[PDB]
Design a protein around this motif. Structure first.
Motif, PDB file in Angstrom:
ATOM      1  N   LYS A   1     -21.773  -9.349  -7.856  1.00  0.00           N
ATOM      2  CA  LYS A   1     -20.939  -8.463  -8.678  1.00  0.00           C
ATOM      3  C   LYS A   1     -19.791  -9.243  -9.296  1.00  0.00           C
ATOM      4  N   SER A   2     -19.146 -10.108  -8.481  1.00  0.00           N
ATOM      5  CA  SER A   2     -17.963 -10.813  -8.978  1.00  0.00           C
ATOM      6  C   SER A   2     -18.258 -11.749 -10.131  1.00  0.00           C
TER       7      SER A   2
ATOM      8  N   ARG B   1     -17.274 -11.251 -14.215  1.00  0.00           N
ATOM      9  CA  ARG B   1     -16.614 -12.336 -14.951  1.00  0.00           C
ATOM     10  C   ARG B   1     -17.407 -12.801 -16.183  1.00  0.00           C
TER      11      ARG B   1
ATOM     12  N   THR C   1     -12.543  -4.787 -10.457  1.00  0.00           N
ATOM     13  CA  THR C   1     -12.687  -5.761 -11.541  1.00  0.00           C
ATOM     14  C   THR C   1     -12.556  -5.118 -12.906  1.00  0.00           C
TER      15      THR C   1
ATOM     16  N   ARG D   1      -8.671  -4.273 -13.272  1.00  0.00           N
ATOM     17  CA  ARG D   1      -7.814  -5.446 -13.383  1.00  0.00           C
ATOM     18  C   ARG D   1      -8.228  -6.414 -14.475  1.00  0.00           C
ATOM     19  N   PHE D   2      -9.520  -6.504 -14.844  1.00  0.00           N
ATOM     20  CA  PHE D   2      -9.869  -7.535 -15.816  1.00  0.00           C
ATOM     21  C   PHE D   2      -9.918  -7.000 -17.238  1.00  0.00           C
TER      22      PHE D   2
ATOM     23  N   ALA E   1      -1.133  -8.240  -3.247  1.00  0.00           N
ATOM     24  CA  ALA E   1      -1.988  -7.094  -2.969  1.00  0.00           C
ATOM     25  C   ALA E   1      -3.407  -7.339  -3.463  1.00  0.00           C
ATOM     26  N   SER E   2      -3.535  -8.296  -4.397  1.00  0.00           N
ATOM     27  CA  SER E   2      -4.889  -8.510  -4.947  1.00  0.00           C
ATOM     28  C   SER E   2      -4.988  -9.770  -5.772  1.00  0.00           C
ATOM     29  N   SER E   3      -5.935 -10.642  -5.425  1.00  0.00           N
ATOM     30  CA  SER E   3      -6.159 -11.811  -6.276  1.00  0.00           C
ATOM     31  C   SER E   3      -6.608 -11.390  -7.679  1.00  0.00           C
ATOM     32  N   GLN E   4      -7.108 -10.178  -7.853  1.00  0.00           N
ATOM     33  CA  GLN E   4      -7.622  -9.759  -9.159  1.00  0.00           C
ATOM     34  C   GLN E   4      -6.522  -9.713 -10.187  1.00  0.00           C
TER      35      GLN E   4
ATOM     36  N   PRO F   1      -4.254 -13.513  -1.221  1.00  0.00           N
ATOM     37  CA  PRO F   1      -5.588 -13.408  -0.620  1.00  0.00           C
ATOM     38  C   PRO F   1      -6.687 -13.910  -1.548  1.00  0.00           C
ATOM     39  N   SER F   2      -7.859 -14.137  -0.983  1.00  0.00           N
ATOM     40  CA  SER F   2      -9.088 -14.312  -1.771  1.00  0.00           C
ATOM     41  C   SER F   2      -9.052 -15.537  -2.672  1.00  0.00           C
TER      42      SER F   2
ATOM     43  N   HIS G   1     -12.056 -16.291  -4.913  1.00  0.00           N
ATOM     44  CA  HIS G   1     -12.287 -15.510  -6.141  1.00  0.00           C
ATOM     45  C   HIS G   1     -11.401 -15.978  -7.281  1.00  0.00           C
TER      46      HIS G   1
ATOM     47  N   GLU H   1     -13.538  -9.286   1.830  1.00  0.00           N
ATOM     48  CA  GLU H   1     -14.641  -8.333   1.618  1.00  0.00           C
ATOM     49  C   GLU H   1     -15.722  -8.507   2.678  1.00  0.00           C
TER      50      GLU H   1
ATOM     51  N   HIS I   1      -4.210  -6.945   3.132  1.00  0.00           N
ATOM     52  CA  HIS I   1      -4.468  -6.440   1.789  1.00  0.00           C
ATOM     53  C   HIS I   1      -5.657  -5.487   1.759  1.00  0.00           C
TER      54      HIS I   1
ATOM     55  N   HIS J   1      -8.049  -1.624  -0.535  1.00  0.00           N
ATOM     56  CA  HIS J   1      -9.406  -1.816  -1.045  1.00  0.00           C
ATOM     57  C   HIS J   1     -10.025  -0.478  -1.437  1.00  0.00           C
TER      58      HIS J   1
HETATM   59  O1  LIG Z   1     -12.275 -10.953  -8.194  1.00  0.00           O
HETATM   60  C1  LIG Z   1     -13.184 -10.430  -7.506  1.00  0.00           C
HETATM   61  O2  LIG Z   1     -14.360 -10.374  -7.944  1.00  0.00           O
HETATM   62  C2  LIG Z   1     -12.931  -9.865  -6.178  1.00  0.00           C
HETATM   63  C3  LIG Z   1     -11.869 -10.364  -5.513  1.00  0.00           C
HETATM   64  C4  LIG Z   1     -11.458  -9.876  -4.150  1.00  0.00           C
HETATM   65  O3  LIG Z   1     -10.378  -8.887  -4.388  1.00  0.00           O
HETATM   66  P1  LIG Z   1      -8.931  -8.850  -3.537  1.00  0.00           P
HETATM   67  O4  LIG Z   1      -8.312 -10.228  -3.728  1.00  0.00           O
HETATM   68  O5  LIG Z   1      -8.168  -7.693  -4.240  1.00  0.00           O
HETATM   69  O6  LIG Z   1      -9.401  -8.579  -2.134  1.00  0.00           O
HETATM   70  C5  LIG Z   1     -12.673  -9.254  -3.452  1.00  0.00           C
HETATM   71  O7  LIG Z   1     -12.145  -8.566  -2.284  1.00  0.00           O
HETATM   72  C6  LIG Z   1     -13.336  -8.228  -4.375  1.00  0.00           C
HETATM   73  O8  LIG Z   1     -14.317  -7.493  -3.619  1.00  0.00           O
HETATM   74  C7  LIG Z   1     -13.979  -8.993  -5.533  1.00  0.00           C
END
Ligand SMILES: O=C(O)C1=C[C@@H](OP(=O)(O)O)[C@@H](O)[C@H](O)C1
Length: 424
Positions: A23-24, A28, A97, A100-101, A166-169, A195-196, A199, A311, A336, A340
């Motif tokens: 999915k990620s 992207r 995603t 945020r994207f 709170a989120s790498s996104q 976090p993450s 990603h 995740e 974090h 979710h």
């Molecule tokens: O960029 C991405 O594709 C994701 C980043 C992570 O998010 P967080 O950093 O908000 O956990 C992961 O947990 C999410 O399932 C997919």
């Protein structure tokens, strides 16, 4: 809705499984293909794309922005321009995603775009990214869903500081569109606890594959130079996070599960995943462009830091609940996860204790003591990974039923069929 009875494994699981695309990585590639097409570079095809609710929400989001996305199976072709209609409204569902994207990408248009999503999505973090867009010159109405991005056909770019704990996104969403900002972007995460990391690195890696120059040489800072995004063919890897749900079947039953098409070098956190499985004394091997995991005859409690791969927590929590009786496992680095799909620390605690288990939420994770479990109704909280965690438990506990197995459509619509074929 009828529950879904999780099949038991009275003997070791033995199976070859193919899981669909990441999915990620798919989402992207859809954003980068959209940027290339919007820059006039032509159409891009994504091969092996995941078809799931989260990627359908992303391709519908791009079509809301005016692009065209063709393809009825796993091959998606993106073309066109960013040219949203009057009243454009992106549905984010529960897809982080998309939430945020796509607002950055949308700042590229000259027509504002409204963002909304599921009731449950309105509880997830988003305000720090909207403040960052305002700092970059974007008018944004609202600090949570629904919000509107009033783009001007241009986005200036420049330097911005953001709390992305709170989120790498929040970082990935800014980075994906940055090469189309006039001056590019320098993003600085302030403070700690980001976090993450895999990603964000996934984002940087795919940007370089598209010809974008990104400097990630200093931790917590990224510099993207303005420049074209190539229109290229994308080849999507299998989703390794979903693969872990299936590999868990081998681990808890002392069986053997192979995943086809496993990449020897991946844009996903493969090395973190294989190391965790090896922590439980599973034997892990690469063969025939596949990954084979043979489960141990038993395993004791383990401590695992999941900050980089949060995740995985629902599957790893199910593994901890099924360790030898009296074992204690500590999952950490995952505060974090309160933000979710659902608050996964609270939900996992609630559903494990409902089955008679012993799971205690901690400030950054869970402490789980393996204790005999009993039948119950494992609730999914509209969260694909809660649903799959219930399936892992039910392998070893008769009478476990997941309330909403269709929650798996977020990233794996065929899960019930694949799981049934695996357990046989
Ligand atoms: O960029 C991405 O594709 C994701 C980043 C992570 O998010 P967080 O950093 O908000 O956990 C992961 O947990 C999410 O399932 C997919």
């Amino acid at each position: 809705m009828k529950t879904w009875p999780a099949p038991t494994a009275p003997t070791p699981v033995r199976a070859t499984v193919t899981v669909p695309g990441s999915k990620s990585q798919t989402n992207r590639a859809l954003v980068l293909a959209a940027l290339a097409a919007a820059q006039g570079r032509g159409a891009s095809t994504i091969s092996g794309a995941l078809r799931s609710r989260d990627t359908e929400l992303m391709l519908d989001a791009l079509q809301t922005l005016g692009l065209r996305v063709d393809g009825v199976g796993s091959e998606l072709t993106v073309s066109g321009r960013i040219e949203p209609g009057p009243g454009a409204r992106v549905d984010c569902g529960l897809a982080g995603t998309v939430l945020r994207f796509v607002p950055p990408l949308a700042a590229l248009g000259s027509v504002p775009v409204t963002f909304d999503g599921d009731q449950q999505a309105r509880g997830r973090p988003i305000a720090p990214l909207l403040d960052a867009l305002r700092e970059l010159g974007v008018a944004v109405d609202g600090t949570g869903l629904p919000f509107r991005v009033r783009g001007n056909g241009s986005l200036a770019g420049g330097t911005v500081a953001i709390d992305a704990s709170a989120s790498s996104q929040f970082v990935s969403g800014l980075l994906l569109s940055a090469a189309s900002f006039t001056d590019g972007l320098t993003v600085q995460h302030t403070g700690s606890s980001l976090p993450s990391a895999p990603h964000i690195a996934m984002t940087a890696a795919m940007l370089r594959q598209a010809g974008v120059d990104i400097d990630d040489s200093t931790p917590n800072r990224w510099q993207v130079r303005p420049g074209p995004v190539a229109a290229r063919r994308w080849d999507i890897e299998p989703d390794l996070t979903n693969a872990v749900a299936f590999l868990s079947a081998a681990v808890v039953s002392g069986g053997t599960v192979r995943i086809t098409g496993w990449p020897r070098v991946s844009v996903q956190p493969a090395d973190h995943i294989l190391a965790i499985l090896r922590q439980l004394n599973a034997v892990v091997i690469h063969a025939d462009s596949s990954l084979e995991v043979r489960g141990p005859t038993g395993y004791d409690g383990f401590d695992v830091d999941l900050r980089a791969v949060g995740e995985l927590t629902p599957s790893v929590a199910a593994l901890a609940a099924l360790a030898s009786p009296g074992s204690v496992s500590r999952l950490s680095g995952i505060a974090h996860l309160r933000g979710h799909e659902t608050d996964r620390l609270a939900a996992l605690s609630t559903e494990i204790n409902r089955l008679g288990g012993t799971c205690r939420e901690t400030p950054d994770g869970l402490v789980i003591t393996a204790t005999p479990l009993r039948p119950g109704i494992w609730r999914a909280y509209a969260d694909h990974r809660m649903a799959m965690a219930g399936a892992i438990i039910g392998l070893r506990v008769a009478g476990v039923e997941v309330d909403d197995i269709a929650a798996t459509t977020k990233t794996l619509p065929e899960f019930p069929r694949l799981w049934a074929e695996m357990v046989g």
